[PDB]
Amino acid sequence: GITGTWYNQLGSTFIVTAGADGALTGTYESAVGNAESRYVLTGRYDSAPATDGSGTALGWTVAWKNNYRNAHSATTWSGQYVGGAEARINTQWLLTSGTTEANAWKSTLVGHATFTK
Amino acid sequence: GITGTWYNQLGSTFIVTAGADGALTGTYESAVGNAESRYVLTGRYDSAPATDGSGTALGWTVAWKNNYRNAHSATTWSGQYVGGAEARINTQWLLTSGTTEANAWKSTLVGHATFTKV
Amino acid sequence: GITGTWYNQLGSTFIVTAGADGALTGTYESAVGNAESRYVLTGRYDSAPATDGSGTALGWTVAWKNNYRNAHSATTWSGQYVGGAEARINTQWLLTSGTTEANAWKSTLVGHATFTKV
Amino acid sequence: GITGTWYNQLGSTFIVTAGADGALTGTYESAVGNAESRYVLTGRYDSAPATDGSGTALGWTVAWKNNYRNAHSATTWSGQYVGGAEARINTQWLLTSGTTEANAWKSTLVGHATFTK
Numbered sequence: 001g002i003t004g005t006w007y008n009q010l011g012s013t014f015i016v017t018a019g020a021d022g023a024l025t026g027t028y029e030s031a032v033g034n035a036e037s038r039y040v041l042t043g044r045y046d047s048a049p050a051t052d053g054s055g056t057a058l059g060w061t062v063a064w065k066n067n068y069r070n071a072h073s074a075t076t077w078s079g080q081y082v083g084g085a086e087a088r089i090n091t092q093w094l095l096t097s098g099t100t101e102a103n104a105w106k107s108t109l110v111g112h113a114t115f116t117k
Numbered sequence: 118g119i120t121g122t123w124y125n126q127l128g129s130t131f132i133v134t135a136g137a138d139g140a141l142t143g144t145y146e147s148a149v150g151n152a153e154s155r156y157v158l159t160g161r162y163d164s165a166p167a168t169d170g171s172g173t174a175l176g177w178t179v180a181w182k183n184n185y186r187n188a189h190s191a192t193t194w195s196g197q198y199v200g201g202a203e204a205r206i207n208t209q210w211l212l213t214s215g216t217t218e219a220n221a222w223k224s225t226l227v228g229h230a231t232f233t234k235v
Numbered sequence: 236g237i238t239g240t241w242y243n244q245l246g247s248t249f250i251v252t253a254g255a256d257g258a259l260t261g262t263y264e265s266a267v268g269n270a271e272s273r274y275v276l277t278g279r280y281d282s283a284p285a286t287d288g289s290g291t292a293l294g295w296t297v298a299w300k301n302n303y304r305n306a307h308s309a310t311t312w313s314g315q316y317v318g319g320a321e322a323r324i325n326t327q328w329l330l331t332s333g334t335t336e337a338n339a340w341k342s343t344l345v346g347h348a349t350f351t352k353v
Numbered sequence: 354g355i356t357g358t359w360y361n362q363l364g365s366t367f368i369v370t371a372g373a374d375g376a377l378t379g380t381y382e383s384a385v386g387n388a389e390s391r392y393v394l395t396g397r398y399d400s401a402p403a404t405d406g407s408g409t410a411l412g413w414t415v416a417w418k419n420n421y422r423n424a425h426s427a428t429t430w431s432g433q434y435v436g437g438a439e440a441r442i443n444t445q446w447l448l449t450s451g452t453t454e455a456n457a458w459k460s461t462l463v464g465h466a467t468f469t470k
């Protein structure tokens with residue numbers, strides 16, 4: 001289902017394991033930004049979705065600090081999984097960077113992304 | 118810093134532990150919506166912030182299924198921690214519900230919130 | 236550039252004129268939600284863009300009251316125009332409904348949309 | 354009601370006239386950003402709100418080009434007006450700047466603001 005290797009249009013990649021648990025654990029690699037190599041991810045999802053043909057709700061977080069680099073920032077993704085012969089995940093995202101109290105009005109970016117398996 | 122008990126002015130509350138490894142682990146109790154009791158939370162944060170006076174970036178997720186009910190929905194929170202005499206967490210949030218293909222245009226709310234400690 | 240007729244893949248459509256004075260003026264017809272017929276639109280855009288290959292920034296608003304019905308709600312669209320052989324407008328949107336003080340936490344949806352011309 | 358002079362916590366100011374019309378027209382001055390002096394604004398609002406004690410829906414747009422400066426960007430505000438002895442307007446905002454197709458993933462900021470009269 002959700003478990004496996006997914007891609008986006010920018011060329012970023014992410015690998016996940018989805019547990020019975022309702023938990024999401026894995027790594028993310030960004031093709032853009034002040035980022036190099038792989039980063040740790042964690043999240044949650046609805047493990048008992050409805051039957052009516054609606055999608056499956058989920059979300060996950062990434063902080064941009066690893067052994068090579070630290071951007072002093074973090075992104076969260078919110079969306080849903082749609083299954084079938086051509087599975088996808090549709091999301092919207094927020095990225096916050098640390099700032100002074102003075103610069104806080106410009107700390108946060110918003111965008112959206114589709115991943116496919 | 119972050120480790121402790123926090124609240125927002127809706128009356129919602131959460132408890133968290135921040136580790137040296139960059140994780141966030143705890144549980145959340147909502148005062149509004151289709152929810153009762155405690156729900157699992159997980160996330161990440163910047164464990165080595167700049168020292169120029171800027172805040173510490175973080176995020177976390179909750180999915181609204183526990184032993185008592187399932188709302189078929191999830192929320193993510195994005196923002197930063199600001200410490201000192203009056204420590205706060207300032208965030209923006211996204212809530213997504215599972216909808217059919219036709220109704221996806223109205224599946225996601227956006228909002229903001231300030232939490233205060235102790 | 237912008238002046239003309241545009242659509243999104245929900246089937247919604249709008250007509251607009253962009254003036255030398257920086258205004259946007261037209262009307263919008265929605266294919267979904269609590270809406271029938273045409274609604275008034277107004278906005279602004281960058282009338283003197285950079286020439287490095289970047290897009291042209293703009294925005295517009297619609298309030299969902301006309302002669303036939305009133306939904307007690309409004310939407311704003313924020314984004315940019317990209318011209319050439321295949322011209323597009325790429326946006327993100329906010330829809331706010333009038334709620335009581337208690338329900339304000341769930342008054343606003345967020346979404347995105349790409350429009351295509353002619 | 355909505356007509357008059359409003360302020361925010363940053364020290365930005367805006368003056369509006371709200372017509373029978375359902376229209377919003379005025380100017381905005383920013384205390385932050387790549388901005389100097391006053392800018393033209395336009396928008397719409399619900400001129401026949403419900404009676405139940407819910408607020409009044411509205412929105413407005415600003416492009417950051419005037420006779421002194423041009424930032425190549427625009428902000429839109431979405432929210433509602435709440436009347437009484439202590440009137441306010443509560444909103445959320447999006448700011449887009451022009452970018453290349455390559456840099457589009459970071460074109461848009463999001464935040465929120467309360468104004469009082």
Ligand SMILES: O=C(O)CCCC[C@@H]1SC[C@@H]2NC(=O)N[C@@H]21
Pocket residue numbers: 008010012030031032033034035064071073075093095458
């Ligand atoms: O520059 C930073 O602050 C760190 C890299 C940010 C990467 C972002 S997260 C949203 C978007 N989607 C991606 O795959 N990468 C960028």
Ligand SMILES: O=C(O)CCCC[C@@H]1SC[C@@H]2NC(=O)N[C@@H]21
Pocket residue numbers: 125127129130147148149150151152181188190192210212228340
């Ligand atoms: O109704 C649901 O779908 C689940 C409960 C949602 C609770 C929300 S999350 C945003 C807001 N902030 C809170 O503390 N509670 C509500």
Ligand SMILES: O=C(O)CCCC[C@@H]1SC[C@@H]2NC(=O)N[C@@H]21
Pocket residue numbers: 222243245247248265266267268269270299306308310328330346
């Ligand atoms: O139902 C309402 O409150 C008024 C109609 C809303 C229509 C929305 S605006 C976002 C989305 N894009 C469209 O073209 N139509 C819907």
Ligand SMILES: O=C(O)CCCC[C@@H]1SC[C@@H]2NC(=O)N[C@@H]21
Pocket residue numbers: 105361363365383384385386387388417424426428446448
């Ligand atoms: O720097 C720019 O691109 C132009 C100035 C941006 C001003 C923004 S709009 C959101 C926020 N609220 C304000 O009063 N000012 C800033």
